[PDB]
Enzyme design. Structure first.
Site, PDB file in Angstrom:
ATOM      1  N   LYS A   1      12.947   2.834  -2.429  1.00 14.92           N
ATOM      2  CA  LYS A   1      11.543   2.806  -2.096  1.00 14.92           C
ATOM      3  C   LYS A   1      10.853   3.809  -3.011  1.00 14.92           C
ATOM      4  O   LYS A   1      11.166   5.020  -2.992  1.00 14.92           O
ATOM      5  CB  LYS A   1      11.323   3.188  -0.620  1.00 14.92           C
ATOM      6  CG  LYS A   1       9.881   3.092  -0.145  1.00 14.92           C
ATOM      7  CD  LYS A   1       9.778   3.197   1.370  1.00 14.92           C
ATOM      8  CE  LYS A   1       8.347   3.290   1.855  1.00 14.92           C
ATOM      9  NZ  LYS A   1       8.373   3.646   3.304  1.00 14.92           N
TER      10      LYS A   1
ATOM     11  N   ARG B   1       0.819  -1.225   0.000  1.00 18.09           N
ATOM     12  CA  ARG B   1       0.000   0.000   0.000  1.00 18.09           C
ATOM     13  C   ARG B   1       0.860   1.286   0.000  1.00 18.09           C
ATOM     14  O   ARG B   1       0.504   2.301  -0.617  1.00 18.09           O
ATOM     15  CB  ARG B   1      -0.953  -0.025   1.206  1.00 18.09           C
ATOM     16  CG  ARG B   1      -2.240   0.773   1.027  1.00 18.09           C
ATOM     17  CD  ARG B   1      -3.418  -0.142   0.687  1.00 18.09           C
ATOM     18  NE  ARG B   1      -3.934  -0.835   1.872  1.00 18.09           N
ATOM     19  CZ  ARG B   1      -4.853  -1.805   1.859  1.00 18.09           C
ATOM     20  NH1 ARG B   1      -5.378  -2.247   0.712  1.00 18.09           N
ATOM     21  NH2 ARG B   1      -5.249  -2.349   3.006  1.00 18.09           N
TER      22      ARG B   1
ATOM     23  N   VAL C   1       9.457  -1.520  -3.068  1.00 14.59           N
ATOM     24  CA  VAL C   1      10.876  -1.503  -2.716  1.00 14.59           C
ATOM     25  C   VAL C   1      11.634  -2.324  -3.782  1.00 14.59           C
ATOM     26  O   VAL C   1      11.218  -3.434  -4.126  1.00 14.59           O
ATOM     27  CB  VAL C   1      11.145  -2.056  -1.305  1.00 14.59           C
ATOM     28  CG1 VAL C   1      12.552  -1.692  -0.844  1.00 14.59           C
ATOM     29  CG2 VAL C   1      10.146  -1.503  -0.294  1.00 14.59           C
TER      30      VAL C   1
ATOM     31  N   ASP D   1       4.989   4.618  13.964  1.00 21.61           N
ATOM     32  CA  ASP D   1       4.555   3.529  13.085  1.00 21.61           C
ATOM     33  C   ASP D   1       5.602   2.443  13.047  1.00 21.61           C
ATOM     34  O   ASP D   1       5.895   1.908  11.983  1.00 21.61           O
ATOM     35  CB  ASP D   1       4.307   4.038  11.678  1.00 21.61           C
ATOM     36  CG  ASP D   1       3.600   3.036  10.816  1.00 21.61           C
ATOM     37  OD1 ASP D   1       2.895   2.161  11.322  1.00 21.61           O
ATOM     38  OD2 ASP D   1       3.784   3.108   9.601  1.00 21.61           O
TER      39      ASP D   1
HETATM   40  O1  LIG Z   1       9.182   1.321   4.299  1.00 19.61           O
HETATM   41  C1  LIG Z   1       9.434   0.175   4.595  1.00 19.61           C
HETATM   42  C2  LIG Z   1       8.278  -0.741   4.977  1.00 19.61           C
HETATM   43  C3  LIG Z   1       6.863  -0.391   4.764  1.00 19.61           C
HETATM   44  C4  LIG Z   1       7.612  -1.505   3.903  1.00 19.61           C
HETATM   45  N1  LIG Z   1      10.734  -0.278   4.485  1.00 19.61           N
HETATM   46  C5  LIG Z   1      11.829   0.524   3.903  1.00 19.61           C
HETATM   47  C6  LIG Z   1      12.081  -0.077   2.495  1.00 19.61           C
HETATM   48  N2  LIG Z   1      12.577  -1.459   2.745  1.00 19.61           N
HETATM   49  C7  LIG Z   1      13.912  -1.889   2.602  1.00 19.61           C
HETATM   50  C8  LIG Z   1      14.888  -0.985   2.962  1.00 19.61           C
HETATM   51  C9  LIG Z   1      16.211  -1.351   2.885  1.00 19.61           C
HETATM   52  N3  LIG Z   1      16.542  -2.645   2.493  1.00 19.61           N
HETATM   53  N4  LIG Z   1      15.641  -3.468   2.190  1.00 19.61           N
HETATM   54  C10 LIG Z   1      15.827  -4.720   1.791  1.00 19.61           C
HETATM   55  C11 LIG Z   1      14.574  -5.262   1.559  1.00 19.61           C
HETATM   56  C12 LIG Z   1      14.282  -6.671   1.139  1.00 19.61           C
HETATM   57  C13 LIG Z   1      15.292  -7.549   0.722  1.00 19.61           C
HETATM   58  C14 LIG Z   1      14.990  -8.869   0.377  1.00 19.61           C
HETATM   59  C15 LIG Z   1      13.695  -9.369   0.470  1.00 19.61           C
HETATM   60  N5  LIG Z   1      13.400 -10.707   0.081  1.00 19.61           N
HETATM   61  C16 LIG Z   1      12.184 -11.065  -0.697  1.00 19.61           C
HETATM   62  C17 LIG Z   1      11.485 -12.279  -0.071  1.00 19.61           C
HETATM   63  N6  LIG Z   1      12.375 -13.444  -0.212  1.00 19.61           N
HETATM   64  C18 LIG Z   1      13.623 -13.238   0.555  1.00 19.61           C
HETATM   65  C19 LIG Z   1      14.306 -11.864   0.308  1.00 19.61           C
HETATM   66  C20 LIG Z   1      12.695  -8.504   0.912  1.00 19.61           C
HETATM   67  C21 LIG Z   1      12.986  -7.191   1.250  1.00 19.61           C
HETATM   68  C22 LIG Z   1      13.628  -4.292   1.832  1.00 19.61           C
HETATM   69  C23 LIG Z   1      14.343  -3.180   2.224  1.00 19.61           C
HETATM   70  C24 LIG Z   1      11.519  -2.277   3.387  1.00 19.61           C
HETATM   71  C25 LIG Z   1      11.220  -1.643   4.750  1.00 19.61           C
END
Ligand SMILES: O=C(C1CC1)N1CCN(c2ccnn3cc(-c4ccc(N5CCNCC5)cc4)cc23)CC1
Length: 297
Positions: free
Chosen positions: A33, A16, A20, A134
């Site tokens: 993001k 929502r 990312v 949050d």
């Molecule tokens: O704003 C948010 C929240 C509301 C979502 N944030 C900041 C933006 N994000 C990230 C920031 C900084 N690094 N980062 C790495 C991942 C990330 C990496 C790998 C995976 N996966 C996919 C599912 N299989 C395993 C690995 C998921 C998210 C996500 C993020 C997610 C957390």
């Protein structure tokens, strides 16, 4: 700009809030993001925050830059930060179980992250007090060294004690409801008082403490990953759904009995319960919680 020097490689999250991506920039991985239209104020506020307050800390997601970009049939709003391949606590907790040491490292590091935000440091190497408003498992990242870092400051609140002014912005977004404190839900929160906003973080933190604890193994059992209040609210709970469970019923996350065989999970159960006082003023402070986690074994 930075946006045009980033190459986008892989979508790692879709919600929502927008998207990312893992991308690359000067040969280094970054998270990009890309914000939904509904959440564009968050991008603005967070851009503002990061560009006014020195936040940098081991347990705060590392900011690189914010940028706009003329992309698809829209102007995209991008926030670019360091990349943590483990993903969020939410993601990570679902792939694995923890031991004493990895459990303590996760929860302490978040405590230290919260504490740093909440404190005001005086002077030019300082900062205003900040409340996140949050905090949740999806916006805390897990680093490979086992420490966590807090992200997603779009709803943050700042306060300084010399000026005694309170910046709350102009944001139509309010917190994630599943994590919303009693006082937020029954609308009794003292909006004029900065301590109110810190205290909502602690509630939220205690709920995170619980998510994490469930995944720590003792005597070879562990609980399945669950979001707080899974048994009494549907997915995507209403603001009204939550008031009923949190305020009217005074329900709190169940502690499994198996935790009381283990001296760590026993000590964290006490801790998370002192984050869930209906009365905000009875909740522990981030710093105290930090001091406590530091003394648990
Ligand atoms: O704003 C948010 C929240 C509301 C979502 N944030 C900041 C933006 N994000 C990230 C920031 C900084 N690094 N980062 C790495 C991942 C990330 C990496 C790998 C995976 N996966 C996919 C599912 N299989 C395993 C690995 C998921 C998210 C996500 C993020 C997610 C957390």
């Amino acid at each position: 700009t930075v946006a045009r020097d980033i190459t986008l490689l892989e979508c790692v999250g879709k919600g929502r809030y927008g998207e990312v991506w893992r991308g690359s920039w000067q040969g280094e991985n970054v998270a990009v993001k890309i914000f939904s239209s509904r959440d564009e104020k968050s991008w603005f506020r967070e851009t503002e925050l990061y560009n006014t307050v020195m936040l940098r800390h081991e347990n705060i997601l590392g900011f690189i830059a914010s940028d706009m970009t003329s992309r698809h049939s829209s102007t995209q709003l991008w926030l670019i930060t360091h990349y943590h391949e483990m993903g969020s606590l939410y993601d990570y907790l679902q792939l694995t179980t923890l031991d004493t040491v990895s459990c303590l490292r996760i929860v302490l590091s978040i405590a230290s992250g919260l504490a740093h935000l909440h404190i005001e440091i005086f002077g030019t190497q300082g900062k205003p007090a900040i409340a996140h408003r949050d905090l949740k498992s999806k916006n805390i990242l897990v680093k490979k060294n086992g420490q966590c870092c807090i992200a997603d400051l779009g709803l943050a609140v700042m306060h300084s004690q010399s000026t005694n002014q309170l910046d709350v912005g102009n944001n139509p977004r309010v917190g994630t409801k599943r994590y919303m404190a009693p006082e937020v839900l029954d609308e009794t929160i003292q909006v004029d008082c900065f301590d109110s906003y810190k205290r909502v973080d602690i509630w939220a933190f205690g709920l995170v403490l619980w998510e994490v604890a469930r995944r720590m193994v003792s005597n070879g059992i562990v609980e399945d990953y669950k979001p707080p209040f899974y048994d009494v609210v549907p997915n995507d709970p209403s603001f009204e759904d939550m008031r009923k469970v949190v305020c009217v019923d005074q329900q709190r996350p169940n502690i499994p009995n198996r935790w009381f065989s283990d001296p760590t999970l026993t000590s964290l159960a006490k801790l998370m319960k002192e984050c869930w006082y209906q009365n905000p003023s009875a909740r522990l402070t981030a710093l105290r919680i930090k001091k406590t986690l530091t003394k648990i074994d």
